Write a protein that binds this ligand. Structure first.
Ligand SMILES: O=C(O)CCCC(=O)Nc1ccc(C(=O)O)c(C(=O)O)c1
Length: 438
């Protein structure tokens, strides 16, 4: 396959549904490269667990943890790492209120080259145990010879775009990684980077980040087809922010408008949102504790009941993962019969203004609160007009894209409710015999 899109291993499914999956120990294995230094960008860390995932021969190599924690949370993380002299920390600045360092990325420097991993999992045991999570694995990027002058750039501009994303941190530990990336040849990269960084972006910079970055890439590198109005947008996520009092405030006005862009020329497009129901969580492999990683609050949800008529159940028979609750986030543009897709995005970004950006100042400024990162698969980057949807995720041309959940998405039934993580569920027990009492 050209796509190098993987799911994490799920404990409890039959082997055929893990044969093409990756555990974190597989990613860090010596078979992927001889490690000399790594950077782990994430939100939540279990440092003791994390070090144990590296091969024993690599456990003393330098590790940089890039996080967004402040105050007591920051002190707790430092305390976790202090036993390991090889671990350094970089606190990503979050100068806008209510922002998060959400990006999940590994930079893996080897004797043999460099690898970039952009994924969706926190660095804790539960996130790699029984969840549906997504991974993009870069090629092994070779080092550019000393004294050789070449760009090392891909047709998707991934090298410059990754350096630009890291430059936004203004961090000395990450300038070191920028210098590493400069010395490597990333020309084989066929995905586009879509990042979010905190700030207020106008004019020259509005297209750099968030949903305007997505819009720019779709305008420049996708084409509009006849009956494009009939091609749905699908969004799939593990959390929801405050979107406003009605759909015109952000969801269907600027977010959907960016996602329905195709091509350069100047809405009835259906919008599917996939988010686990209470029943999805109750009957999942983890049971109700899966909902600890689906942090949709009642305070937020009760202000936007209009949103839930867009919600569709989690179903993933294609990958054997209907009972592995999703912490992956994906967005895509299927054809009206869901047999093809115009593009596919895997990302850390949930359905929230903090992650994707919200327009300010009479539409002239895009304000983003958080760090996010994802990769965009466009047919033009593979010499294609569209991707065929792979019928079974782990089955056998290779030009079919492995969509990890079922299409078409199934609307909530009249008795279904979205998972809300801070109210109790005491009517029916989960797969472990328990109720949920927050
Ligand atoms: O959107 C907003 O305005 C706030 C909504 C609250 C929220 O969703 N918090 C959250 C934090 C960390 C992670 C993670 O890194 O796993 C996740 C997740 O991805 O589920 C979610």
């Amino acid at each position: 396959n050209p796509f190098q899109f993987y799911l994490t291993r799920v404990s409890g499914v039959k082997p055929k549904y893990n044969s093409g999956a990756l555990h974190i120990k597989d990613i860090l294995s010596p078979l992927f490269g001889t490690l000399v230094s790594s950077a782990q960008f994430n939100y939540c860390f279990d440092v003791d667990w994390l070090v144990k995932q590296y091969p024993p021969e690599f456990r003393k190599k330098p590790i940089l943890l890039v996080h967004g924690d402040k105050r007591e949370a920051k002190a707790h993380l430092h305390a976790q790492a202090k036993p390991y002299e090889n671990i350094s920390l970089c606190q990503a600045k979050l100068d806008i209120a209510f922002g998060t360092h959400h990006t999940k990325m590994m930079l893996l420097l080897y004797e043999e080259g460099l690898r970039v991993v952009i994924h969706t999992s926190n660095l804790i045991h539960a996130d790699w145990h029984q969840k549906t999570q997504g991974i993009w694995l870069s090629p092994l990027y070779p080092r550019i010879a000393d004294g050789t002058h070449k760009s090392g750039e891909s047709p998707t501009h991934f090298k410059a775009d990754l350096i630009s994303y890291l430059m936004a941190y203004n961090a000395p530990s990450l300038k070191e990684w920028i210098d590493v990336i400069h010395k490597h040849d990333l020309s084989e990269t066929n995905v586009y980077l879509i990042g979010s960084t905190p700030g207020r972006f106008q004019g020259s910079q509005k297209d750099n980040w968030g949903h305007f970055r997505l819009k720019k890439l779709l305008k420049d590198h996708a084409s509009s087809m006849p009956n494009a109005e009939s091609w749905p947008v699908v969004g799939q996520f593990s959390s929801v922010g405050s979107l406003g009092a009605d759909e015109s405030k952000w969801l269907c006005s600027e977010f959907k408008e960016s996602m329905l862009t195709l091509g350069k020329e100047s809405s009835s497009v259906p919008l599917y949102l996939i988010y686990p129901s209470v029943e999805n969580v109750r009957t999942s492999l983890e049971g109700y504790p899966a909902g600890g990683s689906l942090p949709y609050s009642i305070q937020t949800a009760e202000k936007q009941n209009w949103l839930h008529s867009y919600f569709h159940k989690w179903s993933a028979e294609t990958s054997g993962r209907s009972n592995a609750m999703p912490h992956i986030k994906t967005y895509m543009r299927p054809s009206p019969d869901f047999s093809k897709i115009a593009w596919f995005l895997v990302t850390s970004a949930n359905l929230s203004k903090a992650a994707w950006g919200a327009l300010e100042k009479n539409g002239t400024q895009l304000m983003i609160r958080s760090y996010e990162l994802g990769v965009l698969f466009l047919p033009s980057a593979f010499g294609l007009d569209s991707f065929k949807v792979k019928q079974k995720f782990f089955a056998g041309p290779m030009a079919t894209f492995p969509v990890p959940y079922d299409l078409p998405p199934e609307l909530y039934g009249s008795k279904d409710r979205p998972w809300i993580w801070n109210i109790p569920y005491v009517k029916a027990p989960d797969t472990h015999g328990n109720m949920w009492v927050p």
